[model samples]
Target chain A: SITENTSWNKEFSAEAVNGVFVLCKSSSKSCATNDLARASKEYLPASTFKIPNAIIGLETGVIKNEHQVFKWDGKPRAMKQWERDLTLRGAIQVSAVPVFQQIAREVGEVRMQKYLKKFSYGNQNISGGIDKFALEGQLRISAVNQVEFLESLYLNKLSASKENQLIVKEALVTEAAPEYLVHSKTGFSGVGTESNPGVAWWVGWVEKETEVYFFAFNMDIDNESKLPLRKSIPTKIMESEGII
Target chain B: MGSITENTSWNKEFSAEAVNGVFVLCKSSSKSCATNDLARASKEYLPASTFKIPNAIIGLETGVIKNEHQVFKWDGKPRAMKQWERDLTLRGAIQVSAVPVFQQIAREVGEVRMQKYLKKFSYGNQNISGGIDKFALEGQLRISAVNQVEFLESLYLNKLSASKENQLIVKEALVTEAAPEYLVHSKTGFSGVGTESNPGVAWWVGWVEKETEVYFFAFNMDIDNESKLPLRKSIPTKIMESEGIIG
Candidate 1:
């Protein structure tokens, strides 16, 4: 029998015991809320940060004008290897690390925080929590919040300037061609030897004529196999439900 | 006495040189090009390669239908990093404004050939021809207000579908807030000087409402001064004044 409070074991324990999956969807007429079973009010956001980096790059003129060149300084010397010569459009396409690092340096951490705060990321805190995290280290955001961010992008609300709004819309509508005009960014991270250590994320908006939808999905898995497993599974779910 | 070409002696040696301090102006009409002498033909435009309004039209159609055959491979990894991703089409290329990559896809030539084409179109040529290999090294294009407007109007009339034409005109109006509403889409560019040499630039263009006029402008200068020179301010003020914004 299933119980709400107890850890339930699957009959196929040999397959995999340690993994977490989450899915979220939004529509043109409705708002996303944290009421679903897999929905956690909080979780650490890793490289998922690249989504905001896109906005930062546009706002500060680091990657100012859409056609501006983004030269690659070689493979990720310090981190993961992504693409080189990304435009504001390409940076989001490949999630290139050097591009975001350069943008952070140009916009500075303080300004990044200002924009993040404006987006209402990680503001809530549960009382008397012993480990007490403030969503700082790798910051945590709910799937609902992620969708809200996407919604803002769809509505031209997140852009800092009129020029930026124009540039971002043009780039996203181009890259996500044939996919209902999706504008999105994805993030991932690997932490050392912790249960469910890897994180995967997708956040973006899709528009069809007068209607728009903002969507986000994230998963955490304990073992290495969880990486591909989570992606295929979550994406399948989204597709089956007509979320994509 | 030294020749007027020398920076230090030019002004002192010749009255014509004395009156020749670099003048940067932003004008309203493309017609003004006929009167301006010191002007280089506007910088070479990279065609509708950039994310102009027309590209947006392409995207709207391509995103919705399979009949367009506007598809490309998004597979294969880029050479610089091992990152694997999908490929894009003319619409995708224009959206991201991926010049070199898109040019490869578009199969266009470098700035030199592009300049030749623009010249054939009756657009003026770049003014600076030599010294320190500036022209060769920079390879920047120039387009005057007159040429830019003509190009934009041409796109509005011939390139866009009726719906796209209407949407772009509306969006352009909202962004620029220019008078005498006209529909337009445009791009801007700026360049950095070499690490050893110091130079800077400011460039911009706008396609106004469909019914009115389109405009493009370029401002370039070599900063040899101690303080930050007001390049952006000085030029726009002159252009606005020329448009009768001020005396």
Candidate 2:
């Protein structure tokens, strides 16, 4: 929501711009940067789209609150312990896709489509596929728009009722450092094969007493090991920009 | 130059995605480095191909090269280098890192005046003992990355006392247009001393001329993965782009 040219983010830009792009913004006018040419280019929401999904699910009464649990439709799968029941908070923490998939199913297509329009998420194209659209390279949003949306919700400006927003907030809090609190989401989409060439994303804002910074970066990740870069690299960016 | 060797200490940790090293950029016009991570800022290594930057001056001063247009006919064979096959002026030799041209120039300068000039330049241990052509790669001609930048500064400032006309010849020889406002004047060195010269030790030393002042840099690597020495150009290019020195 705020834009200003801060100093060059050397540590962050030097690496992030290696194979992808990075855009960082802060609430205070003193710090901000959006230097990538593709900062305005749109991309899939990936699992990060779940941030809005959680808000929509709670606001529409499809999910009760942070305590709302989705019982694992028990089936052996690739990820361990995912077959057990999980609470809304637990689903976000592990980023267990099936858990959120069930939640999306409960919310159904009509309400999901309605919220897509309400949030103006991407191109308003839910017609491609549900649950998968955000990660199937179907629905698209930009790095600029990602921070703007997060900034709006962070300020409690979304149509989602206030407590639901707080519930999403509680579901996403990470890194409770003495000087700051970080609320973020990480997402991965597609295969690493050249034909698919997956994308990795880390999105959210940091609040430390008086300063707030919203940063979102989605970069080209060609392998599973690079997935950690989604969160770790953006974290480096925030620390480098000194917005934390 | 391509480096080929294995199990050496330098190449062990690096992969092509990243280079395990640091470079310094000094504006004769300002300071050289970031005050961090360079434990070996003054540590020395063979000057390798960078010796040609100075040899170009020697060739001029001793009247061996005479002027910029003294074109040496290329040897027509790469020998150990892929870039060696061509007719080269002092300018062309600097551009292509043509070993034969500088090698011939070094031979013509002989040992005495070269010794005198090396003392005046205070260049890298002042050693031309290993024969003029081989000394930079294999002899006692060790230099620090810091010393390279300082000498480059003197050359640009014409403080080494070569005529402006001679200095301008070598300066223009280093000229490459990385962009409209920038002229990248540099040379790269690779000293593959049979896998023991810290074998893959590579160098990129140059100064850049912007609209007003000029900046000098020395980036060397004893390491890369699949290990390449190419980060020399790309890394500095990124830093310069960040500072708006390159578009």
Candidate 3:
């Protein structure tokens, strides 16, 4: 009888804190317990860590390739009238923040804390003595570590060679859709007062045939006046789960 | 030093969720971070989630693909030829945005790997932020709401796509002097929603470069209220402490 009318109801529902959703379907798949009963294991990865700063700026050759040639320092200036320059793909299309703090001071902070402790990201309650620069205790990523750090940058294993993983796939931004091709990254975090008003992100990947699919989305809001609520809940969960 | 005086007295008795460092660097360089935090605005976007454009063009067309690789079934159906078809990439179409498994991996991943990964990451002519043609998103390239608030507070200015190795890095590496720390790469979003009492919602875009420098960060943070917990604790901890993501 449809497996005895598919039992398992557990309770009712409403309070809702944890929220996770997964669908492997391929790549050695196996995770759907009805999507793990509506998933929930991680959250706190706001602005999807900007895709690991575009995969450590192409495995640390510093911004010299990705079209290099940046310029445009001009937000609340004082550091000698900002707009220094731009390139590393025009400061990540325009996320700038002092050109990524001058590339994190040239990735120093001891090689950015040795690649944040070899990319294990958060464990040990939030990871050890981190301090890449200093902002509130540091190192905290979840949502399955932001989809396994964007599935290890969609499997270049965090590039360094292979022509720097094809220069981060020639620096992302594509969409064709005859069937597949979508690479993404979007994040926004600012409102903070504690009601939510912080954390809005979408991590990405999707490639079909030769397989690859990774995603992380965190949209925790409440106030700080809603902070430009974009794309409406992942496009209404990709149009009520027809997904795209 | 008592942990640097208890980390400068916990960054001066840590005030909870307060924002306004020029609207938190213009909401992490979506633009308007007070117009100078390294100005470069203009890249606004939304409508992501179609599996991020075939998983970023299959990592710019076949080069990095592993999260346990295997994605077939584009229409062949039948199921389970290794669970139906196989060889998916761009990290399995971003773990699961799966649109026919990334439209059959972006048609066997080609278009010259999407114009050679958008001109080897310079994204040259721009477009894509929400392209379908709003004029290709307004003829692209302009970003200067103060270098888009220092390119969302700096994540090495966002770079990545050498093929593999960077593996989505960023444990807080910003290194400056113009740029360093293995270039950069970025991605972010929040989505839209509005019920009208001020609704609207959120959205963001990404990209960052290195070698010398590069940038890109889009924004949208609408308001109204259906509750997202105070906008998720002050926008990703204030754009991860101004794009550096601290220790």
Candidate 4:
């Protein structure tokens, strides 16, 4: 059983944000969390899906390598940061939606479902169409499951080759401090959208010399500004827990 | 220059990022040094937020700060970053890079006492001339990456002129990572290039303790744009991990 982590409540309560956080030690299988009930609750993966999307792309040969550049095609994009050509690493860095969406379209319905089942991602339901399911369609993953998925990716235990898993992992490193590495991804579904209330996520692990700690967090967000809390709240909890 | 030697190959690490900077790593057990740019390592620049190391030290030594537990309340004034708006403990302030909290602590330490300690610590140019509060951030005082490592090594050994207790206190506050085999105590500084008049000088300085050996490092990079700021730590880390100092 995952231990109830009261230590995390302060960060979420301080912001008056409702959320669930799950941190697991890969070695001991020891876990701590704020809410076990909500942790199992499912929500859209949003941009966080890019993690699996990239790995699958690598495994399927949709992406030749991290350095393969996806041309801009001179078309406008939703975010200004996405207006130029971006390599796979650059795309993941900026959380470029269209690039990942294009990859999903190419992965198609058949192979996409095949890998999702293999990875046991979320409910394994991609009924909402390949390109839109994780964005706004039927696909969903619980924070707890997110941690499990990240653990597999970290250990190179996923269906993808160890090389492919590592390629995706390296791209996720947001921080490389001298003593440890922080690998994380952030996602925001949307605030007050017609289909759902906004949900934000921050999921990743810390790589220390001795061990790795995988964590996943999701919170209800009512506004765009609250998106940063996805990362900040988890960080504070990690600091308090001495996981970072 | 005693035992420090230039490792010109490390220069490729900087060139790969197109950053101009110096990196100095000192191994206490061997009493030796490895660096990419020896001359630049000795050259001085404003201490920037890296001054927090001593600023934090003096605050505790002078009784301006009661203890690590003491809270420095935020006045609700707008700060450089949103993270600075709330009340912070000494550790919280340092982690967030809250300037006002440290500025307040410096003012409380006062110029005369500040001078006394800097002279004793043999830190930088020992000039806090611009003003009591803004000197390190925007003053004439300067410290080089080499000096940074020396000072850090002394503190790690509790050899600084300050009390062993106070040095240990400040050191613990700088803990960025703590694991079973290794512990890292680091502080970062920026001279405010994108936001200040001075061309930015970014710094990441501290020591890593792995088992019996302690490795002290000081890194500073020329920052023409804010985007290059991450290189301050990344370039040095790449070089250090490649050399197998800390992985």
Which is the leading candidate under lDDT? Answer: 4
Candidate 3, backbone clash total: 232
Best prediction by DockQ:
3
Q: Candidate 2 regions off by >4 Å?
A: A1-31, B1-247
- Model 1 misplacement above 4 A: A1-40, A74-83, A123-138, A169-179, A194-196, A208-210, B1-247
lDDT per residue (tens digit) for residues B101-214 in model 4: 899899999999999999988899999999998999888899998889989988876788887656756775677764434567899998877443446799999988654467
Worst 10 residues of 4 chain A by lDDT: A170-179
Residue A239, candidate 2: alpha-carbon lDDT: 68
Q: Which stretches of candidate 3 lie over 4 Å from their true place?
A: A1-163, A171-244, B1-200, B208-213, B223-247
lDDT of each: 0.42, 0.67, 0.40, 0.83
- Using all chains and alpha carbons, the TM-scores for the candidates as numbered come to 0.44, 0.46, 0.25, 0.53
lDDT (0-100) at residue A89 of candidate 4? 54
Q: Which stretches of candidate 4 lie over 4 Å from their true place?
A: A1-244, B194-198
Strongest candidate by TM-score: 4
Worst 10 residues of 2 chain B by lDDT: B1-10
Where does model 1 sit among the CAPRI classes?
incorrect
Give lDDT tens digits, candidate 2, residues B72-161. 776566555655565555555666667777787888998898889989988988878888778887787888877888788887666786
Please compute DockQ, using alpha carbons, for every candidate against the native two-chain complex: 0.02, 0.01, 0.10, 0.02
Ranked by lDDT from best down, the candidates are: 4, 2, 1, 3
Lowest lDDT block of 10, candidate 2 chain A: A23-32
How far residue B189's Cα lies from its native spot in candidate 4, in Å, is 0.7
- Of the two candidates 2 and 3, the one with more favorable lDDT, higher being better, is 2
